[PDB]
Amino acid sequence: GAMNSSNYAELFNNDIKLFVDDTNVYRVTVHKTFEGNVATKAINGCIFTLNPKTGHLFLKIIHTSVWAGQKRLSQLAKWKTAEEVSALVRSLPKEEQPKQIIVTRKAMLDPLEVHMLDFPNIAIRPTELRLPFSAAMSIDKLSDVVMKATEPQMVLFNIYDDWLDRISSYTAFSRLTLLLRALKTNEESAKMILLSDPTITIKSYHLWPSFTDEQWITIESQMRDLILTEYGRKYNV
Amino acid sequence: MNTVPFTSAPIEVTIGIDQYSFNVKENQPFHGIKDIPIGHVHVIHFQHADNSSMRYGYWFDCRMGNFYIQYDPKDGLYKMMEERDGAKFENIVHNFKERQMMVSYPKIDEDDTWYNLTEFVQMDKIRKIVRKDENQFSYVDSSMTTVQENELSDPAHSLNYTVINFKSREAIRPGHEMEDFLDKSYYLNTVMLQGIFKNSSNYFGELQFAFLNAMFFGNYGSSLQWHAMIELICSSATVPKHMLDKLDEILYYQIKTLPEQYSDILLNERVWNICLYSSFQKNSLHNTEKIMENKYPELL
Ligand SMILES: O=C(NC[C@H]1CCCO1)NC1CCCC1
């Protein structure tokens, strides 16, 4: 059934599974027209498809041309998401195909189920977890490849950089979810914490800075403080 | 003009004949039902006074043979049987009529209710849904499951309704996923109408039979089939005008006849709300919408 706090360790077992987050597929700027009406302008988006055990991120860039001449775009965006996830599964060798796909938003269930009818043994699941994957576009290198795209493109990343050399998938996912929750709550503050000490850089081949184990503990602390600082500023107490 | 005689009535029972019903006492001198209108299928149905779990009956058409009811004290039910000796049967029926030991099918001359509920229902189609080829009549009860229910046990005692599943390869053409899921016209018109049923009359007959099994036996799988066949039409943007107008008439009489007190177990809130207020056909079912809003506004 639903993925929740009670069945959380299942993410890091040896059954291939992917999270699919569709919150950055259809993105718009809202603006006034010359006549004083309101219009939208689409900008490039992305499907965020992540293996939580390996860190492999299948970032399908959604170019604004997809939307041209289409109606009901927020509805179409769920179906386009399901079409592209289905195409990704069919592109993988059988031994790499996921056993389960967990959608971050319940509105993705029917679209994905219908596109995956040919895969009756792949379980399509919701989650009770409130995951911060909307904040993926606060990772500079991911935002840059999305905004520069001139055509539909799939770009592969490991969202954990080399962390799995030193830590378990459980701890790597916890670190990622804390970083993305901080970036989601106060982007400027989170980026300042990550990028303040200029001596710690991001490797060309990485998304996050090259923190030693001790530095990660300090960073993790500063992120938890930010989430509680911001939760204080929000609710006043 | 047709008659279904009873050998006897050894156990107290409520007997239904189509939309009518009457109580028979244990060992009451009851010998059956006369003046049954020729031209329609009929259903005779039973609920035992000592055990309301025993809820069962027989679809028949008196044009297809001479049928009678006889209680079986071993299997503990009223069984339909065919009498092959025409002269014996005519002689039995004449005696029971002369002695006035039969109830009269109580049709009001003005009243087209039964025709309106069975317009498209044919015995030959019933006998394909309910498989017992050695009899010309068909047994249904409250507990019989559908082929679709048995997929999600005993196959020979099942209701062979046409399987409708909105999230099935049959319903969804490769490459037309969003189109076919949000607009079921291809599934309705190509797969179901052209492919399986051959015409709208057979589709309506199955829909009508499913509703009647739901209403008369509380058959849960029949109720599912009735609502699936409504939803498949209501969820199609492209439906012939004649089918929409006919469906409005069909549903109007079904809602009119449903006992008020079973509305809560016989009607699916989600399907009716979707069909009347959200679907492609939300504005096509004028008569149905009006009777539902006046009779069952709580559901809506
Ligand atoms: O290209 C790799 N990762 C994604 C890059 C693109 C921009 C930031 O990170 N890794 C390759 C380096 C050696 C083996 C695979």
XYZ file of C-alpha atoms and ligand atoms in Angstrom:
552
model
C 0.000 0.000 0.000
C 1.243 3.533 0.945
C 4.938 4.147 1.839
C 5.022 5.740 5.379
C 7.228 6.133 8.565
C 6.368 2.457 9.514
C 7.839 0.914 6.271
C 10.754 3.410 5.741
C 13.670 0.887 5.734
C 12.067 -0.748 2.643
C 13.591 2.171 0.605
C 17.117 0.787 1.224
C 16.547 -2.938 0.613
C 17.708 -4.795 -2.574
C 14.351 -4.461 -4.498
C 14.922 -1.821 -7.238
C 12.545 1.079 -6.678
C 12.186 4.642 -7.959
C 10.584 7.755 -6.520
C 8.838 9.886 -9.159
C 8.203 13.585 -8.336
C 6.212 15.580 -10.897
C 6.125 19.008 -9.052
C 8.665 20.635 -11.440
C 7.280 19.215 -14.741
C 4.896 22.125 -15.574
C 6.387 25.461 -14.412
C 5.072 28.934 -15.212
C 5.647 32.634 -14.563
C 2.294 34.484 -14.100
C 2.270 38.036 -15.630
C -0.021 40.969 -16.669
C -0.881 41.443 -20.395
C -0.948 44.856 -22.168
C -4.793 44.909 -21.652
C -4.291 44.198 -17.888
C -5.382 40.511 -18.050
C -3.203 37.743 -16.581
C -1.313 35.171 -18.657
C 1.213 32.400 -17.969
C 4.543 31.788 -19.677
C 5.872 28.196 -19.357
C 9.547 27.638 -18.469
C 11.501 24.384 -18.809
C 10.748 21.733 -16.178
C 11.923 18.275 -15.187
C 10.732 14.931 -13.934
C 12.656 13.911 -10.787
C 13.012 10.098 -10.883
C 15.326 8.827 -8.115
C 16.636 5.418 -6.938
C 16.898 6.094 -3.139
C 19.299 3.135 -2.651
C 21.898 4.059 -5.322
C 21.335 7.847 -5.660
C 20.888 7.472 -9.453
C 18.722 10.382 -10.640
C 17.035 10.172 -14.074
C 16.377 13.880 -14.711
C 14.051 14.113 -17.774
C 14.098 17.739 -18.906
C 10.642 18.926 -20.059
C 11.153 21.590 -22.723
C 8.404 24.272 -23.088
C 7.792 23.056 -26.705
C 5.918 20.028 -25.133
C 3.094 22.391 -24.081
C 2.692 24.172 -27.447
C -0.961 24.136 -28.584
C -2.040 21.831 -25.741
C -4.940 22.490 -23.326
C -5.412 21.640 -19.598
C -1.610 21.644 -19.076
C -1.673 20.740 -15.303
C -3.629 17.556 -16.277
C -1.442 16.852 -19.352
C 1.704 17.247 -17.195
C 0.734 14.194 -15.079
C 0.163 12.067 -18.226
C 3.428 13.315 -19.878
C 5.226 12.404 -16.601
C 3.713 8.891 -16.678
C 4.560 8.556 -20.446
C 8.220 9.488 -19.809
C 8.585 7.210 -16.699
C 7.046 4.325 -18.743
C 9.503 5.102 -21.619
C 12.412 5.109 -19.071
C 11.387 1.712 -17.632
C 11.080 0.211 -21.170
C 14.597 1.616 -21.975
C 16.211 -0.176 -18.971
C 17.387 -3.790 -19.221
C 14.937 -6.173 -17.489
C 17.361 -6.726 -14.516
C 17.430 -2.888 -13.975
C 13.637 -2.316 -14.151
C 12.111 -1.278 -10.835
C 9.866 -3.628 -8.808
C 8.022 -0.555 -7.360
C 7.540 3.094 -8.367
C 6.579 5.446 -5.495
C 4.843 8.687 -6.611
C 5.213 11.716 -4.312
C 1.703 12.996 -5.319
C -1.459 10.800 -5.339
C -2.654 12.497 -8.587
C 0.185 10.552 -10.391
C -1.279 7.114 -9.476
C -3.877 6.649 -12.263
C -1.724 8.203 -15.034
C 1.255 5.985 -14.115
C -0.883 2.843 -13.600
C -2.481 3.278 -17.052
C 0.907 3.864 -18.769
C 2.401 0.789 -16.978
C -0.433 -1.743 -17.768
C 2.179 -3.766 -19.805
C 4.130 -4.130 -16.448
C 1.525 -5.733 -14.132
C 4.264 -6.873 -11.636
C 5.604 -3.280 -11.134
C 3.767 -1.923 -8.041
C 2.667 1.744 -8.295
C 2.516 3.185 -4.735
C 1.751 6.494 -3.046
C 3.561 7.718 0.055
C 2.496 9.379 3.351
C 6.036 10.958 3.448
C 6.106 14.747 2.676
C 9.333 14.640 0.602
C 11.046 17.889 -0.401
C 11.923 16.869 -4.006
C 10.203 20.113 -5.326
C 13.440 21.793 -4.105
C 15.575 19.872 -6.713
C 15.614 23.066 -8.819
C 17.485 24.772 -5.876
C 20.507 22.512 -6.751
C 22.425 24.894 -9.034
C 23.774 22.255 -11.504
C 20.256 20.697 -11.901
C 18.564 24.135 -12.415
C 21.330 25.055 -14.960
C 20.853 21.946 -17.210
C 17.036 22.415 -17.081
C 17.071 26.178 -17.954
C 19.738 25.776 -20.742
C 17.880 22.877 -22.531
C 16.739 23.752 -26.112
C 15.083 20.331 -26.637
C 13.808 17.361 -24.603
C 16.824 15.670 -22.944
C 17.489 13.096 -20.229
C 20.508 13.802 -17.941
C 21.843 11.261 -15.397
C 23.253 12.243 -11.983
C 24.128 10.559 -8.705
C 22.362 12.885 -6.208
C 24.567 11.452 -3.368
C 27.885 12.356 -5.120
C 30.415 9.862 -3.527
C 28.678 9.742 -0.071
C 27.933 5.969 -0.365
C 31.746 5.353 -0.150
C 31.491 6.470 3.530
C 27.787 6.181 4.612
C 24.789 3.870 4.126
C 21.914 4.647 1.676
C 19.672 5.287 4.761
C 22.049 8.029 6.018
C 22.587 9.382 2.418
C 18.790 9.723 1.882
C 18.411 11.364 5.342
C 21.161 13.897 4.406
C 19.562 14.563 0.984
C 16.033 15.028 2.497
C 17.485 17.409 5.183
C 19.369 19.475 2.514
C 16.301 19.674 0.256
C 13.945 20.497 3.185
C 16.349 23.381 4.169
C 16.540 24.597 0.531
C 12.713 24.428 0.337
C 12.159 26.328 3.658
C 14.794 29.102 3.163
C 16.754 28.778 -0.080
C 19.072 31.818 0.450
C 19.995 30.674 4.016
C 20.614 27.037 2.932
C 22.839 28.103 -0.026
C 24.803 30.477 2.325
C 25.386 27.551 4.779
C 26.521 25.236 1.902
C 28.705 27.784 0.036
C 29.994 30.228 2.828
C 33.518 28.653 3.297
C 35.168 29.129 -0.170
C 37.937 26.524 0.643
C 35.327 23.660 0.349
C 34.370 23.438 -3.321
C 32.035 21.309 -5.474
C 33.935 18.853 -7.655
C 33.206 19.276 -11.426
C 31.563 15.779 -11.333
C 29.507 16.475 -8.111
C 26.361 18.457 -7.073
C 27.273 19.233 -3.404
C 30.492 20.441 -1.730
C 33.351 18.087 -0.724
C 32.684 18.129 3.077
C 34.752 15.875 5.339
C 32.706 13.634 7.709
C 33.176 16.260 10.534
C 32.126 19.151 8.238
C 28.932 17.184 7.215
C 27.920 16.940 10.932
C 28.370 20.798 11.299
C 26.472 21.384 7.983
C 23.680 18.973 9.059
C 23.438 20.910 12.408
C 23.275 24.308 10.591
C 20.469 22.901 8.337
C 18.383 21.564 11.287
C 18.902 25.045 13.062
C 17.653 26.788 9.832
C 14.544 24.553 9.642
C 13.825 25.354 13.353
C 14.896 29.114 12.967
C 12.394 29.281 9.999
C 9.759 27.260 11.860
C 10.187 29.879 14.691
C 9.951 32.891 12.272
C 6.808 31.226 10.692
C 4.692 30.442 13.808
C 6.283 33.284 15.974
C 7.092 30.873 18.961
C -52.381 -15.966 -20.229
C -49.434 -18.193 -19.126
C -49.357 -20.064 -15.818
C -46.651 -21.323 -13.456
C -48.346 -23.877 -11.213
C -46.874 -24.990 -7.846
C -47.118 -28.620 -6.672
C -47.569 -27.255 -3.096
C -46.133 -24.708 -0.619
C -44.755 -26.737 2.307
C -42.680 -23.900 3.869
C -43.696 -20.320 4.684
C -42.174 -18.045 1.995
C -42.409 -14.587 0.437
C -42.887 -15.187 -3.342
C -41.935 -12.485 -5.853
C -43.225 -12.390 -9.442
C -41.431 -9.536 -11.268
C -41.971 -6.344 -9.211
C -44.839 -7.943 -7.175
C -44.662 -10.066 -3.994
C -46.973 -11.926 -1.573
C -46.667 -14.092 1.545
C -47.570 -17.814 1.502
C -48.105 -19.663 4.852
C -46.602 -23.137 5.665
C -48.967 -25.719 3.947
C -51.247 -22.934 2.528
C -53.364 -24.322 -0.378
C -51.333 -22.258 -2.890
C -50.959 -23.736 -6.422
C -49.225 -20.939 -8.356
C -49.479 -17.841 -10.548
C -51.782 -17.359 -13.556
C -52.397 -14.615 -16.203
C -48.603 -14.037 -16.666
C -48.144 -11.650 -19.639
C -46.751 -13.305 -22.767
C -44.029 -11.311 -24.522
C -41.623 -10.607 -21.700
C -39.100 -12.516 -19.580
C -40.281 -12.957 -15.970
C -38.598 -13.731 -12.679
C -40.194 -15.802 -9.885
C -38.276 -15.335 -6.600
C -38.281 -16.604 -3.051
C -37.328 -15.545 0.440
C -37.972 -18.113 3.166
C -39.755 -16.727 6.307
C -37.532 -18.895 8.606
C -34.258 -17.899 6.814
C -34.021 -14.654 4.766
C -30.465 -15.858 3.632
C -32.388 -18.206 1.230
C -33.031 -15.505 -1.519
C -33.118 -16.980 -5.005
C -35.243 -17.269 -8.114
C -35.718 -18.217 -11.757
C -35.749 -16.215 -14.957
C -38.111 -17.801 -17.517
C -40.179 -17.046 -20.607
C -43.465 -19.065 -20.851
C -43.110 -19.099 -24.647
C -40.120 -21.508 -24.216
C -41.917 -24.309 -22.280
C -44.371 -25.331 -19.561
C -42.692 -24.506 -16.194
C -43.775 -25.301 -12.639
C -42.413 -24.955 -9.100
C -42.000 -27.868 -6.660
C -40.410 -27.703 -3.207
C -37.417 -30.064 -2.724
C -37.229 -31.037 0.991
C -33.657 -32.340 0.508
C -32.070 -29.205 -1.075
C -34.551 -27.053 0.931
C -35.763 -24.839 -1.904
C -38.548 -24.147 -4.377
C -37.207 -25.520 -7.725
C -38.379 -24.639 -11.216
C -38.961 -27.654 -13.455
C -40.181 -28.138 -17.051
C -43.221 -30.400 -17.754
C -42.661 -32.013 -21.209
C -46.228 -33.645 -21.265
C -48.382 -30.700 -22.583
C -51.741 -32.435 -21.917
C -50.819 -33.380 -18.304
C -49.680 -29.749 -17.678
C -52.812 -28.188 -19.333
C -54.971 -30.596 -17.241
C -53.183 -29.679 -13.933
C -53.415 -25.904 -14.679
C -57.150 -26.224 -15.635
C -57.936 -28.045 -12.245
C -56.035 -25.447 -10.128
C -57.683 -22.512 -12.004
C -61.175 -24.148 -11.597
C -60.486 -24.519 -7.827
C -59.131 -20.845 -7.733
C -55.929 -21.933 -5.990
C -53.750 -19.481 -8.010
C -52.848 -15.786 -7.562
C -53.363 -13.620 -10.632
C -50.389 -11.634 -12.014
C -51.731 -8.240 -10.863
C -50.918 -6.039 -13.899
C -52.673 -2.569 -13.914
C -53.749 -1.902 -17.589
C -52.057 1.619 -17.701
C -48.805 0.210 -16.240
C -45.748 -0.434 -18.484
C -43.255 -0.782 -15.510
C -42.243 -4.376 -16.341
C -41.876 -3.767 -20.109
C -39.826 -0.644 -19.263
C -37.483 -2.603 -16.972
C -37.066 -5.604 -19.412
C -37.304 -3.841 -22.857
C -33.907 -5.208 -24.036
C -33.755 -8.378 -21.823
C -33.891 -11.686 -23.802
C -33.928 -15.223 -22.315
C -31.254 -16.329 -24.860
C -28.930 -13.576 -23.469
C -29.791 -14.513 -19.834
C -28.859 -18.180 -20.594
C -25.333 -17.015 -21.727
C -24.741 -15.010 -18.521
C -26.185 -17.852 -16.333
C -24.783 -21.195 -17.779
C -27.080 -24.269 -17.171
C -27.730 -25.492 -20.711
C -30.014 -28.455 -19.774
C -32.730 -26.024 -18.446
C -34.622 -23.319 -20.464
C -34.914 -21.163 -17.266
C -32.061 -19.614 -15.217
C -31.415 -19.754 -11.445
C -29.964 -16.674 -9.718
C -29.383 -16.004 -5.983
C -28.029 -13.351 -3.581
C -24.547 -15.035 -3.236
C -23.593 -15.950 -6.874
C -20.344 -14.174 -7.844
C -19.411 -12.733 -11.227
C -16.544 -13.923 -13.464
C -14.962 -10.449 -12.689
C -15.357 -10.946 -8.864
C -13.801 -14.519 -9.215
C -10.652 -13.024 -10.959
C -9.940 -10.543 -8.033
C -14.550 -19.518 -7.054
C -16.822 -22.323 -8.557
C -17.094 -21.306 -12.279
C -20.391 -23.197 -13.117
C -22.444 -21.166 -10.464
C -21.095 -17.722 -11.627
C -22.684 -14.784 -13.463
C -20.855 -14.463 -16.847
C -21.388 -10.664 -17.184
C -19.099 -8.959 -19.768
C -15.911 -7.849 -17.920
C -15.545 -4.025 -17.838
C -12.294 -2.699 -16.343
C -11.301 0.977 -16.995
C -7.595 0.182 -16.184
C -7.088 -2.802 -18.493
C -5.253 -3.171 -21.849
C -8.712 -3.875 -23.382
C -9.878 -0.375 -22.278
C -6.677 1.549 -23.284
C -4.943 1.585 -26.699
C -1.110 1.734 -26.497
C -0.198 5.391 -27.278
C -3.730 6.652 -26.445
C -3.435 6.278 -22.612
C -4.652 9.768 -21.480
C -7.187 10.054 -24.339
C -8.753 6.599 -23.713
C -8.747 6.915 -19.849
C -10.361 10.395 -19.803
C -12.716 9.668 -22.817
C -13.970 6.041 -22.861
C -15.588 6.357 -26.389
C -13.211 3.831 -28.073
C -13.797 1.300 -25.238
C -17.626 1.844 -25.441
C -18.067 2.114 -29.261
C -15.267 -0.092 -30.789
C -14.438 -2.653 -28.072
C -17.828 -3.115 -26.346
C -20.559 -2.092 -28.877
C -18.968 -3.131 -32.250
C -16.699 -5.857 -30.722
C -18.515 -7.776 -27.978
C -22.228 -6.805 -27.732
C -22.635 -6.205 -31.553
C -25.417 -3.559 -30.842
C -26.771 -1.207 -28.137
C -29.832 -3.504 -27.603
C -27.610 -6.360 -26.234
C -25.629 -3.807 -24.086
C -28.875 -2.426 -22.585
C -30.255 -5.963 -22.045
C -27.207 -6.903 -19.929
C -27.413 -3.544 -18.040
C -31.157 -4.150 -17.347
C -30.545 -7.794 -16.253
C -27.725 -6.689 -13.914
C -29.992 -4.058 -12.252
C -32.852 -6.559 -11.806
C -30.509 -9.192 -10.184
C -29.175 -6.381 -7.911
C -32.691 -5.267 -6.909
C -34.437 -8.686 -6.609
C -31.585 -10.747 -5.036
C -29.297 -8.051 -3.476
C -26.635 -9.602 -5.762
C -23.579 -7.394 -5.103
C -21.680 -8.353 -8.307
C -24.765 -7.509 -10.377
C -24.890 -4.068 -8.726
C -21.197 -3.539 -9.665
C -21.945 -4.543 -13.311
C -24.997 -2.192 -13.578
C -22.957 0.798 -12.326
C -19.912 -0.092 -14.555
C -22.151 -0.183 -17.669
C -23.688 3.232 -16.760
C -20.271 4.747 -16.027
C -18.833 3.481 -19.334
C -21.535 5.386 -21.294
C -21.490 8.543 -19.065
C -17.631 8.613 -19.305
C -17.674 8.592 -23.197
C -17.703 11.987 -25.009
C -19.082 10.315 -28.229
C -22.338 8.303 -27.824
C -25.135 7.961 -30.400
C -28.089 10.322 -29.506
C -30.548 7.346 -29.587
C -28.466 5.449 -26.965
C -28.369 8.478 -24.610
C -32.132 9.077 -24.904
C -32.792 5.331 -24.368
C -30.383 5.140 -21.350
C -32.246 8.109 -19.742
C -35.552 6.129 -20.093
C -33.952 2.889 -18.789
C -32.418 4.532 -15.693
C -35.576 6.608 -14.979
C -37.703 3.406 -14.627
C -34.943 1.656 -12.606
C -34.719 4.575 -10.129
C -38.564 4.828 -10.082
C -38.947 1.116 -9.165
C -36.074 0.802 -6.599
C -37.500 0.424 -3.033
C -36.808 3.768 -1.213
C -35.486 1.805 1.822
C -32.726 -0.032 -0.274
C -31.479 3.165 -2.038
C -28.458 3.276 0.395
C -27.167 -0.295 -0.518
C -28.293 -0.311 -4.256
C -26.855 3.104 -5.406
C -23.136 4.012 -5.600
C -22.745 7.710 -4.572
C -19.462 8.160 -6.526
C -20.824 6.778 -9.836
C -24.169 8.678 -9.711
C -22.520 12.005 -8.652
C -19.865 11.564 -11.412
C -22.524 10.523 -14.017
C -25.108 13.314 -13.322
C -22.748 16.251 -12.448
C -19.140 15.616 -13.818
C -19.271 13.297 -16.867
C -19.496 14.076 -20.610
C -23.186 13.090 -20.348
C -23.931 15.224 -17.191
C -26.610 17.159 -19.227
C -27.937 14.197 -21.375
C -29.989 12.322 -18.694
C -32.778 14.859 -17.987
C -35.424 12.372 -16.738
C -32.945 10.390 -14.608
C -31.430 13.565 -13.073
C -34.952 14.844 -12.181
C -36.153 11.582 -10.500
C -32.820 11.130 -8.628
C -32.884 14.788 -7.339
C -36.539 14.391 -6.165
C -36.341 10.828 -4.756
C -32.692 10.543 -3.452
C -31.257 14.085 -2.879
C -29.255 12.759 0.190
C -27.163 10.448 -2.078
C -26.370 13.527 -4.264
O 29.186 13.163 -15.356
C 29.111 12.738 -14.213
N 28.202 13.239 -13.369
C 27.225 14.292 -13.643
C 27.989 15.614 -13.656
C 27.410 16.589 -14.669
C 27.467 17.947 -13.989
C 27.668 17.651 -12.513
O 27.916 16.253 -12.383
N 29.942 11.775 -13.799
C 30.935 11.206 -14.712
C 32.330 11.523 -14.195
C 33.113 10.216 -14.179
C 32.131 9.079 -14.412
C 30.768 9.688 -14.689
